[PDB]
Every structure is written in structure tokens, then in C-alpha cells.
Amino acid sequence: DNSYKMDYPEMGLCIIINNKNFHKSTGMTSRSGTDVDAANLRETFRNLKYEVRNKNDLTREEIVELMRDVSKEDHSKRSSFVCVLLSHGEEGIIFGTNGPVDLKKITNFFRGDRCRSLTGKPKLFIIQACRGTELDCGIETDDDMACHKIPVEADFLYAYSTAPGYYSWRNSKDGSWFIQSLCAMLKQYADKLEFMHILTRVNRKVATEFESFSFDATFHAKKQIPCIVSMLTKELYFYHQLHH
């Protein structure tokens, strides 16, 4: 068991929270291009045989209710769980249409002790959002214990679009740099490569192929690196190999 069992009857859910339009009172700008990401993700995970549910323009309360309700489903026949968050953000925070939600509140519903039918199974959170206001200017190139337990934080993978503290960038026509790159690398490589190696290729693609273009010099010629955060305990492949 160097690899997660992915031959349950269902690969699992892929919940996509697509927040485009924000309450006027928040000051947050419409996230042009996010529907392109939401559609790309839906097709990409369809082809990986996930049950995709797209949700659009959820309040902070609706995000928490959705995540609570999804965590209370019986996932026993599912191999894994995927949640994609597309919104404005700050470090540790994703925005509902009407204000901030701590990411930890969301992911806690899926802890090994709180969502028992996902215990031992990979729980993936893919987060396209800023993590702060830093800009990357780039650079030119004895005891066995008896009862076995696992940590309640084990088997999570957080695929952040950007490094801690930094901006994350989006193109109004093409979608976010990270989600564009993630879908392209899953389409190209999910039938062979292990997920960390797919995400490493996503890192390279975002790092090398994108550079911002802005009439505002403050935001021009900027760069981005995504940030893979893994508490996984096994290799993750999006396929299984039949025995006959």
C-alpha cells in the first residue's frame, strides 16, 4: 500500500465553488474569467470520472452549509474527495460573496475523526485565491502501541494557486493562471503520472509561461509560483489498473 485505493465504485465528488459576483458592500471586483475556470475544471474532472457539482456565487454562510452537508454524506463507496474554491482570498481565508470564511472552518468538516467515510482517503482542496498582497517581481534566467490510529489531519492535500502571502493572478478572458495550468496538466498526464508530479509540472508551467501585463506599473511583469501542501500518506493516481 504505497498508493491510495482508487478502485472503489466511485472516484468521488468534485465540488466546485465558483464565486464571481460579490456584494457591493464588500468592495470586491467581479472575477471575470472565473466561469472559464469553472467549466474547464468541470470537464477535466468529468474525464477523471468524478461526480462534479458546480455551485455559483455562494455567501459565506452558504459555503459553510454546503461543506457541512457534503461532509455528512456517506462517502463509503467513494475513493476520494475534491473541493475547488475559486474566489477572492487572503492568507488562510476564502471569500463568500458577502464576506470571509476561514479555510480551516471548511476543511475541518473533513477531518479524519469528523468525516468517517473519508478516513484514510485523499481529501483534495484546490484553492484559486490570493494569500496576501506580496508581489513576485521574478528574476531573469520499542512501542507498537496496540490500537492503530492515524492523525486527524492526515490524507489532506491543499493545492494552492500561489505562495503564502502573495497575490494570485487571473486573466479575464482565459481564466486563472493556476487553474488553466492545472487542467492542462491533468488532461495531459493524469493517465500516467502521480499527482505530486502532475502538480510539480503545474508549478513549472505557472512559473515559466506566465508573466503579468498591466498598464499599472505596480502590477506589471509580475510572476507567480503555486504552493503544494501535502499531508498525504500515499501516492495518488487518478486511474486504477484492472487485474484481467
Partner: peptide
């Protein structure tokens, strides 16, 4: 074209 999240 370019927008921040």
C-alpha cells in the same frame, strides 16, 4: 486581461 484574486 489581468485581474487579482
Amino acid at each position: 486581461x489581468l485581474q487579482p484574486x
